Amino acid sequence: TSWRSEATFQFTVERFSRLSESVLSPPCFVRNLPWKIMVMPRFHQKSVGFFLQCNAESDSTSWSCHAQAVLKIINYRDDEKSFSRRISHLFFHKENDWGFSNFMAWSEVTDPEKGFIDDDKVTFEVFVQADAPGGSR
């Protein structure tokens, strides 16, 4: 099941408005690699840093995964309004994570009227598709 080429997994960050540091989600396996969502506030204009991390703990320096993904902050009210952005990147030991330091504006995601924050909880979602070595077929 960890050999799959794609997957969609979520990560909820509680007490979000108080977040003053980086938090990391448990791994989700795709192409036998552990993928994670990394979140953190970035700096008077504050923004949400949202990144996709792949196999960062590995000592190995010969692994690589070409992947495209949809980094999305879910909107509890109107899904049509779920905020998402796409990435494409070659993950490997020197660049094991990719995303947006200015994914979205802190004031907007933490606005109780915008639909992204509920009971101070914000949910992140990532749909990732990764390649893998194989024959030409």
Residue numbers in the entry: 63 to 105, 111 to 204
What does the original paper state about this entry?
To facilitate formation of a stable p53–HAUSP complex, we generated a chimeric protein with the C-terminus of the HAUSP TRAF-like domain (residues 53–199) fused to ten amino acids corresponding to p53 residues 359–368. We reasoned that such design would ensure a 1:1 stoichiometry between HAUSP and the p53 peptide. Binding by the p53 peptide does not induce any significant conformational changes in HAUSP as shown by the structural comparison of the free and p53-bound TRAF-like domain. For example, Pro359 and Ser362 in the p53 peptide anchor its interaction with the HAUSP TRAF-like domain; missense mutation of Pro359 or Ser362 in p53 abolished its binding to HAUSP. Mutation of Trp165 and Phe167 in HAUSP, both involved in the hydrophobic pocket that accommodates Pro359 of p53, resulted in a complete loss of binding to p53 (unpublished data). Similarly, mutation of Asp164, which forms hydrogen bonds with S362 of p53, also significantly weakened the ability of HAUSP to bind to p53 (unpublished data). Two non-polar residues, Pro359 in p53 and Ala226 in MDM2, are positioned at the same site upon binding to HAUSP and make similar van der Waals contacts with a hydrophobic-surface pocket near the edge of β-sandwich in HAUSP. This residue is Gly in p53, resulting in a loss of van der Waals interaction at the P3 position and consequently contributing to a relatively low binding affinity.
Here we demonstrate that both p53 and MDM2 specifically recognize the N-terminal tumor necrosis factor–receptor associated factor (TRAF)–like domain of HAUSP in a mutually exclusive manner. The crystal structures of the HAUSP TRAF-like domain in complex with p53 and MDM2 peptides, determined at 2.3-Å and 1.7-Å resolutions, respectively, reveal that the MDM2 peptide recognizes the same surface groove in HAUSP as that recognized by p53 but mediates more extensive interactions. Structure-based sequence alignment of the three HAUSP-binding peptides revealed a conserved four-residue binding motif with the consensus sequence of (Ø/E)-G-(Ø/G)-S, where Ø denotes a non-polar residue.
